Amino acid sequence: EGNATISVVLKTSNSNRAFGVGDDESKVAKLTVMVYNGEQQEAIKSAENATKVEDIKCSAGQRTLVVMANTGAMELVGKTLAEVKALTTELTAENQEAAGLIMTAEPKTIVLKAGKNYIGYSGTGEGNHIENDPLKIKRVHARMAFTEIKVQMSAAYDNIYTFVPEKIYGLIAKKQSNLFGATLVNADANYLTGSLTTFNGAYTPANYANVPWLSRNYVAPAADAPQGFYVLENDYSANGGTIHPTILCVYGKLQKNGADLAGADLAAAQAANWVDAEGKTYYPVLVNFNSNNYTYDSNYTPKNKIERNHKYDIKLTITGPGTNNPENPITESAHLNVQCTVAEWVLVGQ
Numbered sequence: 001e002g003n004a005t006i007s008v009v010l011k012t013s014n015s016n017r018a019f020g021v022g023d024d025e026s027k028v029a030k031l032t033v034m035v036y037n038g039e040q041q042e043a044i045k046s047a048e049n050a051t052k053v054e055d056i057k058c059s060a061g062q063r064t065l066v067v068m069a070n071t072g073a074m075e076l077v078g079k080t081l082a083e084v085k086a087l088t089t090e091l092t093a094e095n096q097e098a099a100g101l102i103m104t105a106e107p108k109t110i111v112l113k114a115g116k117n118y119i120g121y122s123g124t125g126e127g128n129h130i131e132n133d134p135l136k137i138k139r140v141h142a143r144m145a146f147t148e149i150k151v152q153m154s155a156a157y158d159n160i161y162t163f164v165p166e167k168i169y170g171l172i173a174k175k176q177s178n179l180f181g182a183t184l185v186n187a188d189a190n191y192l193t194g195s196l197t198t199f200n201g202a203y204t205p206a207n208y209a210n211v212p213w214l215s216r217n218y219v220a221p222a223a224d225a226p227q228g229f230y231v232l233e234n235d236y237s238a239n240g241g242t243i244h245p246t247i248l249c250v251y252g253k254l255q256k257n258g259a260d261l262a263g264a265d266l267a268a269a270q271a272a273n274w275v276d277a278e279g280k281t282y283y284p285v286l287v288n289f290n291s292n293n294y295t296y297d298s299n300y301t302p303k304n305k306i307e308r309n310h311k312y313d314i315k316l317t318i319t320g321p322g323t324n325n326p327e328n329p330i331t332e333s334a335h336l337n338v339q340c341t342v343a344e345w346v347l348v349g350q
Contacts, residue, residue: 004060007118024098028070031046033066036107040081051349081107089232115128140179142311148223150316165250171193185305218250235306274322282323313340316337
């Protein structure tokens with residue numbers, strides 16, 4: 001005969017404490033397990049709102065196991081292995097509500113024994129345990145968000161300048177990534193932004209489009225309600241030459257003596273490249289980026305890139321005027337301070 005079944009259990013969090021609402025820990029809505037005989041799909045079985053798929057019918061022999069979650073309307077039935085391995089995704093408005101956050105594990109070469117096979121059952125149940133440990137799948141997206149924005153004007157600007165936030169933006173967000181691979185960055189060269197495509201900055205990429213869902217009306221960030229965006233992988237770690245760093249930005253009016261900028265004050269702040277024509281200023285933060293006014297908690301080293309399954313939480317302290325071009329090299333004036341906490345998400349059980 002050679003008929004077999006396989007059952008796959010995912011690694012979920014062993015948490016003894018509830019997770020805070022602002023953390024957006026990963027949840028599985030749909031889970032798909034595929035079993036490949038060479039290139040052809042031999043089995044494909046989904047569960048909804050579950051962290052395991054059981055009793056998948058297949059046959060004895062060497063196979064490739066592929067596991068994907070939260071793939072929504074993506075068509076997986078009948079895809080070849082090479083087709084599934086080369087799948088891509090693009091950033092969506094849906095991702096900004098933490099929906100459509102695809103999770104994958106790397107494809108795994110296994111041998112099915114006739115009868116029952118298990119992955120993630122820690123030796124429990126009769127049959128062949130290909131792997132004892134529950135299988136780890138990870139989000140392909142990352143999140144950049146403010147958890148705090150505070151204005152503490154330094155001595156030159158205190159009791160003179162104030163800042164009235166209006167928008168929070170995601171800039172230079174790479175449009176596409178792969179879903180499998182040691183890295184998910186790929187060669188597609190398209191980028192998205194919630195602000196202008198016209199800044200013509202040192203960071204501005206040639207292929208660039210505005211989308212309304214990378215911009216938010218300003219809401220005072222809180223730990224329970226981080227303010228930011230989901231993004232895909234993007235590498236800006238080059239030693240030199242042009243880089244395209246993903247940026248989280250706050251934008252608003254720079255007022256002086258309690259009033260909108262006018263006259264000589266406006267002209268001076270415009271000439272200083274602090275404010276644009278409407279007296280408004282930008283405070284950009286290059287995410288996961290090594291800069292001297294960025295501090296990272298607990299001796300983490302920024303890698304100058306967006307990595308999947310990472311939460312980049314930013315505390316921003318504003319101490320002077322900002323910039324009128326948020327896409328120009330990490331500003332010469334340290335009129336802001338960043339403290340960033342970085343973490344990886346886990347999968348919470350059902």
